[PDB]
Design a protein around this ligand. Structure first.
Ligand SMILES: [Ca+2]
Ligand SMILES: [Ca+2]
Ligand SMILES: [Ca+2]
Ligand SMILES: [Ca+2]
Lengths: 176, 176, 176
């Protein structure tokens, strides 16, 4: 699991993946706000104070996900979490957003064993991510930035910036 | 809940949101067409005759959603329903479509309390909405119009019109 | 059901659709890798050896879906399977991908009875499909091709080819 958090069907992994399957299902079935938050704190690497993740929520590992304080994640979010996904404070994430830590080689022979490479995703403080957005590997979204609904983010986004479209392009500066 | 249906963690609201969590889960788990339709009529503001909503279906409040007659909504649809969402008769909605009544201010200080503003969405009669479409706040789609799969609709769409792309642009007139 | 696999509320159909509702729910609730694979082999037309479909997975009929060997389908995939969907060997499909076998007529009068037309989708061997992709009717993706995350594929994609954007356009040749 350490060749993987560093971006290369293991024993540890298949247990951790199977634990997450258990907890996800339990969370997505929980009708109780407190019990979900509780279960989620057992799924996630870290889930901050006054923070909230709406079900159904999907990921593979859980423990690679760290979520800060007063951040809200809306329903139906998918996170391919083979590499760390770090989300700061006061972050808003709209529904059906996708985080793809994983990806593969172009060459089909380099794919027959399902070799995944993973690069972490970082969402800094006070960021608003629109519904239906995709964020691919290695992306950092800088503090106080906005990603418009349905964008696909392939490159790092500077702080105090608005971005939209697909690929995402910088629409305007939110600097004072 | 009235400062909100008018587009500004309340008592009523947290009950209505918690009721919807209950019913959604029950609907999405129901293997019985009649019992789903029954449960859905208890979730929704209104669900018309010969109308059909395929599970899993996701929303927050339920009671702000009014669906007309002979309309079909395919599976995995998400509706952020803080403001009314009104859907007419003979409407077809493809799977994984998103309705976002909610949104936020650009300014990150105007977002720390998760203040949402909500504007209603209206889908008139005989409209066909493609799979994977996003419809943002305040949008009306006029009667007999078509929205192509994967479009993102930000502005009102006239009747008898075909629209596609992202942002949606008017592709051709379906007027006789 | 034969006017339909050939691309036009029946008895057979409503049973087969209702069986799939049963099995889907059972699969998406299964915490056991072996039991899912088992249940999935009962849902699908064919599910090959060393092949893997991650829950939750959504479709309508199940029996029209044939999946080859060593292919991996990630979570939250939706398949409108009124016409055959044929997926080869060593295929990778990213999460939240959509296959739309179904579609409708532009004309709203040609839609009041929810008449669907269906055209099959074929994904050949060694193809990698990115997360969040839409594939519409009648599309074949040729062997060893790559479809970048979030593309919408409307036309056939030649083998040894990389495609991306929406509509998908051919980005580069993966021929040796
Ligand atoms: Ca999308
Ligand atoms: Ca980077
Ligand atoms: Ca408007
Ligand atoms: Ca074709």
């Amino acid at each position: 699991l350490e060749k993987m958090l560093k971006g290369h069907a293991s024993a540890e992994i298949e247990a951790l993946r199977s634990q997450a399957g258990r907890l996800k299902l339990e969370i997505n079935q929980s009708l109780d706000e407190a019990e979900r938050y509780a279960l989620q704190r057992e799924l996630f690497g870290h889930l901050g104070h006054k923070s909230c993740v709406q079900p159904p929520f999907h990921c593979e590992f859980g423990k690679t996900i760290r979520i800060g304080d007063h951040t809200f994640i809306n329903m139906n979010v998918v996170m391919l979490d083979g590499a760390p996904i770090t989300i700061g404070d006061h972050v808003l994430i709209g529904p059906s957003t996708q985080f793809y830590t994983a990806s593969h080689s172009l060459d089909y022979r380099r794919r027959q064993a399902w070799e995944t490479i993973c690069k972490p995703i970082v969402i800094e403080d006070d960021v608003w991510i629109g519904g239906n957005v995709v964020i691919n590997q290695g992306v950092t979204i800088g503090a106080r930035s906005v990603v418009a609904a349905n964008s696909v983010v392939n490159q790092d986004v500077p702080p105090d910036t608005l971005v939209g479209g697909t690929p995402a392009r910088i629409l305007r500066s939110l600097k004072d």
